[PDB]
C-alpha cells in the first residue's frame, strides 16, 4: 500500500521533498493517503502529501476530495494506491 509523498516545508523539517511513501500500518487496520494545500483565491500552493492512518473520514472514498467550506488549510484523504496524485475541492 503506497502514497504520494510531498512536503513543501522539507528544507525546514529536514525531510525529502517529493516522491512516494510505503505505508507502515497495523495488522487489520485500513490505510489512507492525504493531501493538503493552501488556496489564495484560485492560486494553489501545495503543503503536504503522504500516508494517513485508518480514519473513517476516508473510508471507501476513491478520489481525494476536500469537503470544508472555506478553510485556512485545505485537507483531503482517500483510499487506494496513489489516490492522492490529483486532488480537488467541493463542500
Amino acid at each position: 500500500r503506497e502514497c504520494i509523498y510531498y512536503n513543501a516545508n522539507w528544507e525546514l523539517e529536514r525531510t525529502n521533498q517529493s516522491g512516494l511513501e510505503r505505508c507502515e500500518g497495523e495488522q487489520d487496520k485500513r490505510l489512507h493517503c492525504y493531501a493538503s494545500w493552501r488556496n489564495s483565491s484560485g492560486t494553489i500552493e501545495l503543503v503536504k502529501k503522504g500516508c494517513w492512518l485508518d480514519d473513517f473520514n476516508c473510508y471507501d472514498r476513491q478520489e481525494c476530495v476536500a469537503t470544508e467550506e472555506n478553510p485556512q488549510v485545505y485537507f483531503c484523504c482517500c483510499e487506494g494506491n496513489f489516490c492522492n496524485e490529483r486532488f480537488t475541492h467541493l463542500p
Binding site: 516545508n9 525546514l12 487496520k29 493538503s36 503536504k48 500516508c51 480514519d55 488549510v73
Partner: protein, 105 residues
C-alpha cells in the same frame, strides 16, 4: 451490560483542540464500556489479579470493587496540526489515541 469496545467519536472542537488540530475535525477513539462479570471471558484477557479481586468482590461487594473495563491496547492516529509557528505539519504515528483492544484489570 458486558465489557466491550464502543464507538466514541471525539470532536476536537468539543475539547477545544480545534485551535491546533487542522485535521481530522473528529475521529474515532473508542470507549471501553461494560462490566467485568464472573466468569471472565477469555477475550477480556483477565489478569490473575483481576480474577482474584473479582472473587474477593463476590464475597465483599461493599468493600471491594469489580475489575474495571479498560483499553488494553492502543492504536495511534494521524493528525495534521499547526506548528509552534503555524506551519501545517504531520504526526503520522500520534501514539495512544484510539482503542485497539479492551479488557479487565
Amino acid at each position: 451490560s458486558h465489557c466491550q469496545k464502543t464507538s466514541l467519536r471525539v470532536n476536537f472542537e468539543d475539547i477545544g483542540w480545534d485551535s491546533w488540530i487542522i485535521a481530522p475535525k473528529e475521529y474515532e477513539a473508542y470507549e471501553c464500556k461494560g462490566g467485568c462479570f464472573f466468569p471472565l471471558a477469555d477475550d477480556v484477557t483477565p489478569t490473575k489479579h483481576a480474577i482474584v479481586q473479582t472473587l474477593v468482590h463476590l464475597k465483599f461487594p461493599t468493600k471491594v470493587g469489580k475489575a474495571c473495563c479498560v483499553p488494553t491496547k492502543l492504536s495511534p492516529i494521524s493528525v495534521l496540526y499547526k506548528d509552534d509557528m503555524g506551519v501545517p505539519t504531520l504526526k503520522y504515528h500520534y501514539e495512544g489515541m484510539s482503542v485497539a483492544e479492551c479488557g479487565c484489570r
